[PDB]
């Protein structure tokens, strides 16, 4: 995969975490931008990004070791639609409905273990554990084996140790999969075993591997959102916290704004499949495209005062952090839900938060698939 850093040439981790300067420059000076080093055409404007992602005919997701029945992301029509549906049966609204109380409890539990005398590391205490545990419980891992699950997860999805983890994971999970085919429950594994689209169904092996792709998709990213939300409430605009506390009805909207403004730096790759000029330039088959959804989320043509955090900007929900078109994130309702709940619960308990002057950002960022991610975020909370 094309690495962010090669295109960006950022001196600091902090700048990759808060790239507002660069995004403005690219949006205004070089919106459709060839990068020789990576031989990559780089797309920044909302309208263009939106249209590249929607126009799969011309911008294919087929890449330039995984049973293609479960290769959803790296597939075009007509295959993609069927591969998506087999999974989507495990993420119905009903299931989100059902999952809320379970997710509620997991959150309460974790907020419980935070007091507010000592400094809290939100990352270790909430950002990382919540989605992992939620997946664990939502899939069908029993409560006691959670720590073992985290262990395989951290190893596999937080950047030979993995070889081991995979196998333990696989042989831990395969039995359970086999068990649940026989004795269904209300969970993802069970949902996925009953999934049938145009006759096709999942093999047990495919269900197991599907759970790995799910975790692959939805732990790093949700966790990044969470850590980042908190970073924002500490550093970006300190009034927001107090605003949210007094009116919890606003937390969803604030989540969209963290998705818009604070999920840096996310991109996607496509490959040109049929020659075209949709970006006002002729691209040819095999040309690689990279769309910078973080930048598009800061395009003034779409969002007013885009370089300011504003949770009341009425169109924040139109951000492209979850992509756009056929591949639009299947787990967005879940990620949104987890964050709503995680944030509400914490707001409901603590009244104020505060930064810690020792803590330096540079020292607590590492490379992730979505540009710099927080290793720890220490704060102090009251109540
Ligand atoms: C903040 C959290 C998340 C973000 C920012 C995020 C972002 C994205 C993005 C940008 C894509 C599009 C990839 C592409 O167009 O090639 C995507 C696809 C996907 N996401 Fe997520 N995602 C998140 C959470 C989740 C979760 C929690 C799950 C599952 C539990 C999930 C499952 C998927 C799947 C299955 C796809 C493939 C969709 C397809 O190709 O049909 N995501 N996500």
From Swiss-Prot:
It is an enzyme of class 1 (oxidoreductase). It comes from the Bacteria. It is found in: Cytoplasm. Its cofactor is heme. One of its GO terms (molecular function) is oxidoreductase activity, acting on paired donors, with incorporation or reduction of molecular oxygen. Changing residue 368 to I: 30% of 15-beta hydroxylation activity (for progesterone). Keywords: Cytoplasm, Heme, Iron, Metal-binding, Monooxygenase, Oxidoreductase. Disulfide bonds: none annotated. Its EC number is 1.14.99.-, 1.14.15.8. It catalyses: reduced 2[4Fe-4S]-[ferredoxin] + progesterone + O2 + 2 H(+) = 15beta-hydroxyprogesterone + oxidized 2[4Fe-4S]-[ferredoxin] + H2O. Has the capacity to hydroxylate certain steroids in the 15-beta position. Also hydroxylates progesterone in the 11-alpha and 9-beta position. This is Cytochrome P450(MEG). It comes from Priestia megaterium (Bacillus megaterium). The gene is cyp106A2.
């Amino acid at each position: 995969v094309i690495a962010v850093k090669e295109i960006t040439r950022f001196k600091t981790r902090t700048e990759e975490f808060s790239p507002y300067a660069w995004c403005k420059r690219m949006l205004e000076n070089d919106p459709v931008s060839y990068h020789e080093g990576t031989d990559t055409w780089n797309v920044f404007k909302y309208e263009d990004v939106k249209r590249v992602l929607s126009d799969y005919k011309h911008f294919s997701s087929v890449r330039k070791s995984v049973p293609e029945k479960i290769q959803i992301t790296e597939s075009d029509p007509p295959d993609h639609r069927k591969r998506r549906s087999l999974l989507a049966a495990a993420f119905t609204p009903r299931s989100l409905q059902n999952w809320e109380p379970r997710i509620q409890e997991i959150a309460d539990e974790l907020i419980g273990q935070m007091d507010g005398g000592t400094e809290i590391d939100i990352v270790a205490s909430l950002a990382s554990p919540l989605p992992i545990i939620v997946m664990a419980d939502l899939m069908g891992v029993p409560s006691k084996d959670r720590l073992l699950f985290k262990k395989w997860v951290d190893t596999l999805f937080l950047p030979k140790l993995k070889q081991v983890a995979a196998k333990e994971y696989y042989q831990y999970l395969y039995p359970i999969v086999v068990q649940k085919r026989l004795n269904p429950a209300d969970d993802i594994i069970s949902d996925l075993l009953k999934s049938e689209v145009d006759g096709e169904m999942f093999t047990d092996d495919e269900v197991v591997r599907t759970t790995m792709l799910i975790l692959g998709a939805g732990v790093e990213t949700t966790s990044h959102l969470l850590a980042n939300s908190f970073y924002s409430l500490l550093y970006d605009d300190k009034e927001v916290y107090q605003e949210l506390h007094e009116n919890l009805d606003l937390v969803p909207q604030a989540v969209e704004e963290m998705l818009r403004f604070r999920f840096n730096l996310i991109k996607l790759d496509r490959t040109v499949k049929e020659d075209n000029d949709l970006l006002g330039v002729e691209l040819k088959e095999g040309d690689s495209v990279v769309v910078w959804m973080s930048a598009a989320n800061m395009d003034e043509e779409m969002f007013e005062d885009p370089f300011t955090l504003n949770i009341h900007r009425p169109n924040n929900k139109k951000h492209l952090t979850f992509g756009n078109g056929p591949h639009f994130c299947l787990g967005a309702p879940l990620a949104r839900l987890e964050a709503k709940i995680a944030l509400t619960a914490f707001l409901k308990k603590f009244k104020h938060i505060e930064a810690v002057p020792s803590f330096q950002l540079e020292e607590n960022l590492t490379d992730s698939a979505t540009g710099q991610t927080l290793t720890s975020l220490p704060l102090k909370a009251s109540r």
